[PDB]
């Protein structure tokens, strides 16, 4: 009748914790080679037949806003960027005075140049005679000084040129947990991403999450189920970003109608800088198309979900960014190696009450970037030959709400971003790390003599 303790080894007992996650990225991506593209070099090949065990009767609480996988992925991509830029050519002797001029074209005065044809000195292979070579830089890359210009990053940090061998192509990366840990996955169709989850399953490795670094518009993401999803840490708080996840992807097409040439000027011995030669064809600016009908149905489907949290009979007005850096006021992204910054004033210019072509957006191109708000490392994106065309999916948004309302029933939303961790939170909301404690004692009528 008197019970006795008995040690059980191998009980389904886990507790929330944080550990060191490793990678996984299939086996066909390793065949992409090209001198180690992005990260996949010594990454473990993904298991051909992954197993996902649905834990019946199990209800586990998730928290996408207090999840450590986001911070780990962020620091991992940062260290990746540094390790990818450590052995590349450093452009230390490139801050020389630039005697720039307009590009060869024919007016008007509203074209504001944008492209500057700079002539300057350069150190050759030998440490004696210099080199009077010219390049073609964007206005966002240069800045005049008292026409003589200079690189915009002179009195900020150093600069290193990205090697032409590697690529900035986001490839699916599976994050896996070591022995003794497990990743819980919420498999409900309406998980707005916080609190208890009815249908929880366990996995060793997550699905292929492509590290697409972008702002305002979530590109190449996971589609939502049924209705579009709206996630926020504090809806009443207008300082917390609002991650929107789409159900139907919005087809976007971005092009660079300036098929360019790569001049291989030689800053020897060894090093070589890739300048931009003359432009073959017409002087055109990069642009992005968004299908008017798709954008209408997507916006009309989102505002119907927005009315479920800010009152049924309210007015939702869309306005573009309030201001700041170029990475926040414009849709910043990467395509073909070039870094576009597109005008998103034609997408967020609407006013919804309670009840056939394409929208083109002006896109600028910058070569000298300082992403992740990093000071000390400026990367020069080498020019890319040929017309660059890319087709992507708009699968979500990062919105911000205006404050100090009180009066009035309308609510105004503007594109935001900045913190790149939000880009990872849009994919890690359905995963969390737990540690296994298989040692459990329990009483029963068992002993020895």
């Amino acid at each position: 009748e008197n019970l006795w303790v008995t040690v059980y080894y191998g009980v389904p007992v886990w507790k929330d914790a944080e550990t060191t996650l490793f990678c996984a990225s299939d086996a066909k991506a390793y065949e992409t080679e090209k001198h180690n593209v992005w990260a996949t070099c010594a990454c473990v090949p993904t298991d051909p037949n992954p197993q996902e065990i649905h834990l019946e009767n199990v209800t586990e609480e998730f928290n996408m806003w207090k999840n450590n996988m986001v911070e780990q992925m962020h620091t991992d991509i940062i260290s990746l960027w540094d390790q990818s830029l450590k052995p590349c050519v450093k452009l230390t002797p490139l801050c020389v005075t630039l005697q720039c001029t307009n590009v060869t074209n024919n007016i008007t005065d509203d074209m504001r140049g944008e492209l500057k044809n700079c002539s300057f000195n350069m150190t050759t292979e030998l440490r004696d005679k210099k080199q009077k070579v010219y390049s073609l830089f964007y206005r966002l890359d240069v800045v005049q000084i008292n026409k003589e210009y200079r690189l915009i990053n002179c009195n900020t940090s150093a600069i290193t040129q990205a090697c032409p061998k590697v690529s900035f192509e986001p490839i699916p990366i599976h994050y896996c947990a070591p022995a003794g840990f497990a990743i819980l996955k919420c498999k409900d169709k309406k998980f707005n991403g916080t609190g208890p989850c009815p249908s929880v399953s366990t996995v060793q490795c997550t699905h292929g999450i492509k590290p697409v670094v972008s702002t305002q518009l979530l590109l190449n993401g996971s589609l939502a189920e049924e209705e579009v999803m709206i996630r926020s840490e504090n809806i009443t708080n207008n300082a917390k970003n609002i991650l929107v996840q789409f159900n139907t992807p919005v087809q976007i097409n971005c092009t660079r109608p300036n098929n360019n040439t790569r001049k291989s000027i030689r800053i020897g011995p060894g090093q070589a800088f890739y300048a931009t030669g003359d432009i073959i064809g017409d002087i055109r600016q990069a642009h992005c198309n968004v299908s008017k009908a798709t954008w209408n149905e997507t916006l009309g489907k989102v505002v119907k979900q927005l009315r479920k949290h800010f009152g049924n009979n309210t007015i939702i007005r869309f306005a573009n960014s309030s201001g700041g850096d170029l990475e926040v006021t414009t849709h910043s992204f990467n395509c073909g190696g070039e870094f576009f910054y597109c005008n998103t004033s034609g997408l967020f210019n609407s006013t919804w009450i309670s009840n056939n072509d394409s929208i083109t957006l002006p896109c600028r191109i910058k070569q000298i970037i300082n992403m992740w708000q990093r000071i000390g490392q400026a990367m020069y994106a080498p020019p890319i030959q040929g017309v660059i065309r890319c087709v992507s999916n708009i699968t979500g948004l990062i919105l911000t709400r205006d404050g100090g309302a009180n009066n009035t029933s309308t609510e105004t939303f503007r594109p935001g971003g900045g913190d790149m961790r939000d880009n990872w939170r849009s994919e890690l909301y359905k995963y969390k790390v737990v540690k296994i404690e298989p040692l459990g004692v329990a009483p029963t009528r068992c002993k020895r003599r």
């Binding site: 040690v7 191998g10 404690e437 009483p443 020895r448």
Partner: protein
């Protein structure tokens, strides 16, 4: 039936006691960025030998299950035999006993195999 690793997580302790050999099997599993997994599998084997050391100094050694000569104190959540194995999950049980786990561990490593084995040394010489 084989629910798999952590299969019987939502089942009762009596039902989850049948899946002991499943969570025990997948518990060990056999330039920078490569040391990321090294330091992790080192902490993995240190966690394994830590649990094996606790399992050894107690009156078990043989894994999975083992009995002990310790009376269950009613203050440690006075529940019944049929209310534990047929009405409570292991997570729910560990949530209540989290206060007394270290106390029981102390009553298991010190009071038992330190007094029991010395008793056997006194019983084996004659």
């Amino acid at each position: 039936v084989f629910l798999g690793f952590l299969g019987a997580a939502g089942s009762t302790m009596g039902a989850a006691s049948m899946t002991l050999t499943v969570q025990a099997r997948n518990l060990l599993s056999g330039t920078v960025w490569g040391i990321k997994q090294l330091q992790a599998r080192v902490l993995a084997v240190e966690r394994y030998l830590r649990d094996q050391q606790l399992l050894g100094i107690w009156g078990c050694s043989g894994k999975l299950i083992c009995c002990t000569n310790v009376p269950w104190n009613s203050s440690w959540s006075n529940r019944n035999l049929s209310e534990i194995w047929d009405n409570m999950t292991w997570l729910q049980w560990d949530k209540e006993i989290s206060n007394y786990t270290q106390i029981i561990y102390g009553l298991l490593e010190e009071s038992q195999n330190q007094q029991e084995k010395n008793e056997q040394d006194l019983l084996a010489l004659d």
